Design a protein around this ligand. Structure first.
Ligand SMILES: c1ccc2ccccc2c1
Ligand SMILES: c1ccc2ccccc2c1
Lengths: 52, 52, 52, 52
């Protein structure tokens, strides 16, 4: 439209990309560490149960 | 308000919607995974106690 | 005048509050769920050890 | 080179620095608390396994 609403759209867009990238990083990390805890807990409990 | 004041509110508002959405996502993911770990732990302890 | 400088300062300042508030919320949530899980584990292990 | 194009670059950069700072803190927090939980889980299981 004009010079103002475009410069605003550019600010919103660029920072949105930043926010989105940092979001995905945190999302994948949370997922990664939670999967590890599940794996470790499962393996250990299975070891305990296998040890009378 | 003035043009620039309305444009400032719009930039903040839009990026706040973004930040909030991403925050809720991580908030929900963290809660989901932690809740599941507690579910897994509580179940495993019940099995270990049943196996004496 | 200087309204563009001030508005940019005003924009950065407002979104900083948003970002920091959500950060603290996630920081406390992550910290809270970790304390809970550690407590649950320690409690359960003591229960298991009390049952030979 | 424009009046507001530099302003936009400043706003995005200034908030990017803040986002990066908070993102890194959560990343470190998530890593540290998960590393801690994994240690606690294994240390506890070693105790149980050592109790017939
Ligand atoms: C601390 C670190 C990582 C986690 C992942 C999922 C749920 C809770 C957590 C607590
Ligand atoms: C997504 C990405 C980074 C963030 C940093 C702080 C608070 C919320 C966030 C949401």
């Amino acid at each position: 439209g004009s010079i103002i609403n475009e410069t605003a759209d550019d600010i919103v867009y660029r920072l949105t990309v930043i926010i989105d990238d940092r979001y995905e990083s945190l999302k994948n990390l949370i997922t990664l560490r939670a999967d590890r805890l599940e794996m470790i807990i499962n393996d250990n409990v299975s070891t305990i149960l296998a040890s009378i």
